[PDB]
Design a protein around this nucleic acid. Sequence first.
RNA 1: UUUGCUCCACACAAUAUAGAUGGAUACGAAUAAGGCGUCCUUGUGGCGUCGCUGAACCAUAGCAGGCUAGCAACGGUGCACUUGGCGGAAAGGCCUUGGGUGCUUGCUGGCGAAUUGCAAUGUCAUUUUGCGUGGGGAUAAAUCAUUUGUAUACGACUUAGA
RNA 2: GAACUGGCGAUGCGGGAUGAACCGAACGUAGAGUUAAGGUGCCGGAAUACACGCUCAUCAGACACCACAAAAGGUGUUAGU
Lengths: 171, 136, 197, 109, 106
Amino acid sequence: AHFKEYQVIGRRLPTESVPEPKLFRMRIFASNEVIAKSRYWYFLQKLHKVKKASGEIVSINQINEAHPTKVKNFGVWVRYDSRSGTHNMYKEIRDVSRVAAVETLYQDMAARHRARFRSIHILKVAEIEKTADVKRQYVKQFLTKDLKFPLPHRVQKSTKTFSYKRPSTFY
Amino acid sequence: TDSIVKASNWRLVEVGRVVLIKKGQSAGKLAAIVEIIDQKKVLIDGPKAGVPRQAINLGQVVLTPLTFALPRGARTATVSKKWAAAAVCEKWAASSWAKKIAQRERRAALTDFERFQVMVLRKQKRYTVKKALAKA
Amino acid sequence: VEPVVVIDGKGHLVGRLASVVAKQLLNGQKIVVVRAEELNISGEFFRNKLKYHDFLRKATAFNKTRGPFHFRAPSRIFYKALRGMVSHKTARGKAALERLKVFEGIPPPYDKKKRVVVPQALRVLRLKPGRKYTTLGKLSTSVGWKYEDVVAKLEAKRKVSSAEYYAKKRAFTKKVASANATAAESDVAKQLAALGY
Amino acid sequence: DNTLLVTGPFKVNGVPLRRVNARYVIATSTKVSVEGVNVEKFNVEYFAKEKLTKKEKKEANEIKTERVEDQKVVDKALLAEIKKTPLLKQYLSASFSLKNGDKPHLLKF
Amino acid sequence: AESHRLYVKGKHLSYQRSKRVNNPNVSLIKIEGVATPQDAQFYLGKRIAYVYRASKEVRGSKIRVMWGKVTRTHGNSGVVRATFRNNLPAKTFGASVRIFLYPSNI
RNA sequence: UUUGCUCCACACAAUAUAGAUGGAUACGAAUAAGGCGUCCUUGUGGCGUCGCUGAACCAUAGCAGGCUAGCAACGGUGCACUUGGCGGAAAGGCCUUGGGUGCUUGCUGGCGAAUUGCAAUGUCAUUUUGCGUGGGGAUAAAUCAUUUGUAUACGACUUAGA
RNA sequence: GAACUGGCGAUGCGGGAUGAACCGAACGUAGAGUUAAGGUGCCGGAAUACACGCUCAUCAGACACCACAAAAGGUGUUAGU
């Protein structure tokens, strides 16, 4: 859906042999708290020997964007499962916030590789603080000095089923 | 002789371009394009008309012929200051586009007595114009 | 809203226009479609010629006379595409289809009337620039229509007469606009401007 | 009985003193002041039909004098208020009708 | 004047139906001018008359009326649902019909 | 074939309506281009303006739209004529000259309206036919039967016969 | 030819165009409202909705059961290592 980012902090259940476990923390892009906690336990079952019955979640907090009106370039490292194997990819997206960047990332992977939400693993997402570290041409195209371009062929959708003059596509 | 081309210019999208929000929650106010995200969407701000600073798809706005000076990525205080300095609100209001919008909403706001009044006045004006249509 | 709606078929897409027009007839609007030779079909001319040859193969084996009839005129091609979208085998479908007449060119009942377009079926508004399209008159005369040039000659004559009409209309409207501008800025003009007219 | 007392005035458009249903009118924004008219005389018993027997059948085929000078009393007080703002007499004399392109959900009355 | 119309024109489109089963008790009406349910909400509760003619004079007239009312909106495009005292005869699919302005809220 | 047939006008009946209820309101071409106005050296020309929908334009007041009076203009519109054209794709329509006549809400007045009783389509459209008037217009063929054989199972076809 | 369960047989209804078994849901006679599975260009009730991409096929493709296609290739095009 429209994604939100949460921090989820959890731990193992405390025993007498070891009280105070190590309080692992992860950042999850998810639609809501339930999906966020499910993905948290999914990745902790991939990492450490723990499961939901043997552990607990001590905190979940929404992390909204610090500057939601700054235009950033993000580099995203992704695992995905194809029909024959597992691959790593690095894609970079020029967008205004992290949740919108990963939303366009999920759309981009589903469009160009037919990869689903169950197949995509988000390794990391990070803002590229400096230009000329941008490595893709499709985003390096929009970083030029005095960028301007026209929008040819305007199509205006009509409300009536009949129009009384030939329309114009000037913009 | 000299070489002749048809130039065919139209309404470039860049910083400082004034746009009119077509649909949405604003839906009819003016904004200024602050920066360009990608081919299909831009970051705009409309601080005099009360449009919050936001990223928006280019299909939800209409570009106007108005342009003024901004550096890219300008914050809303600078956007409002340059908007007031270039004074593009009455420059928009002087256009026939805004006059058409104002005419449409005035005709929508007329009542039945005012519709009777414009019918009487239109009959009087039609009488004098068709009287003028007999000498030329 | 109108008694009869006259649609200029030039530059329109066949299927999208037919799906607009069939719903208009089923709702009860009378439609006449003129200039059927200038419809457009998306795709290559060779693709649509191959499509028509695949349609032309189909006939009843034991008697070709009772088989599917392959009509060759552009108007009858449009009629086929529209009869596909009207449930023509019922009385409601027949009553709908008798509210339609489709013509090549603009006949003398309709050359003095007003032609409209359907903007959601126009080729310049629907297709991406770069996609290839066909002309229905060219495809139809490739598959056997005999009257492509006589329609062109009649259309040239009609366009000459219509330009002669339009010159007089433009001169008259410039006189009327001049008189309206000179009779503006009076008291009734300012009161009408305050009231929105 | 939840009805509205209305008048034309009868000199303007020929509508007499009458009562109508509130669900069968449109309240326009045009307002005149009716202070100075003594309408407390009229009530539900003022309009009586004098119901007809079943024997009296009209095979093929009048007005109260009290009603006609009551109308003449009230309408001369209304038209004095009508003469202040222009074109109200013409507006009340003209009829209302829907033209082509009139959308009543968008029209303001 | 030359116009005396105090109603809104509409078209009787069809019955309420699924893909293969129709229901004659609820008719579907296209009111002209309205293209959204929010504008169609103005017309709820208004009376509808289907006015037709017959050869045989019944009580002084050769014109017969079928009365009904608007009940709810239908779809996203301003079609409304209408119920009548006797259902519409289904040969009137595409026939004109009158939506009156009473009972008015304005 | 006992006064029949067609057209025109209204008079009354019948007959129905795939569905009037202000107006189908006429360039062509392009869409990575145009429209309109203006100017010139008339062009793939210069300059200005417009679009961002018909949410337009025209029409629109009067007993379902009456009866009258005046002012101002010499306009606008309807009807029956009338002069001249143009239109063959399915022309059956478009334009125009002249006079008549009616209305005019361009402006200002006078009289009428009720009782359909608090709504009831509250009836005003066009399609076909018949029968009457009274006014024009014109006075045929086909088939069976007979015959032919360029035809033919029979029908049909091709011929002939005051 | 066996094991566990659910069905059809014995069962109509909405969807899968069509079908014993699939999906949804099981049934007195009616009214109103809301939905399931499935859909909303037209047939056909319902957005020619919104948003991001991809594809142009001189046999495109279009939805589980289900009404088929493989190995091997292609400076076609897109995204990656």
